[PDB]
Amino acid sequence: KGALALEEKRRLEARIAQLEEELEEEQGNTELINDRLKKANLQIDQINT
Amino acid sequence: QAKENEKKLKSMEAEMIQLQEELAAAERAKRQAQQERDELADEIANSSG
Numbered sequence: 241k242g243a244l245a246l247e248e249k250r251r252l253e254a255r256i257a258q259l260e261e262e263l264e265e266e267q268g269n270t271e272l273i274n275d276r277l278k279k280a281n282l283q284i285d286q287i288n289t
Numbered sequence: 290q291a292k293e294n295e296k297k298l299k300s301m302e303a304e305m306i307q308l309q310e311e312l313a314a315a316e317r318a319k320r321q322a323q324q325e326r327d328e329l330a331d332e333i334a335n336s337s338g
Contacts, residue, residue, distance in 0.1 A: 242336045
């Protein structure tokens with residue numbers, strides 16, 4: 241149980257670590273989509289004027 | 290009668306000798322269990338704990 245308990249953390253560690261990449265996808269979208277809006281808003285603002 | 294009475298003493302000694310055989314093993318069992326009831330217990334808190 242002790243050896244399996246320590247090994248159990250490795251399974252969740254990879255899941256908790258791999259899950260970070262999944263969460264980073266939405267996190268990156270907030271930075272990538274927002275960054276695209278700045279480039280789009282700059283062109284939309286110039287096109288509007 | 291002294292020789293006959295002495296035969297009862299040696300015969301009765303078998304009871305004390307037989308009781309010592311189980312008493313020595315029973316008493317020694319506590320030492321073996323105590324050595325394991327405490328050593329493994331302290332290690333259980335480190336391995337299982």
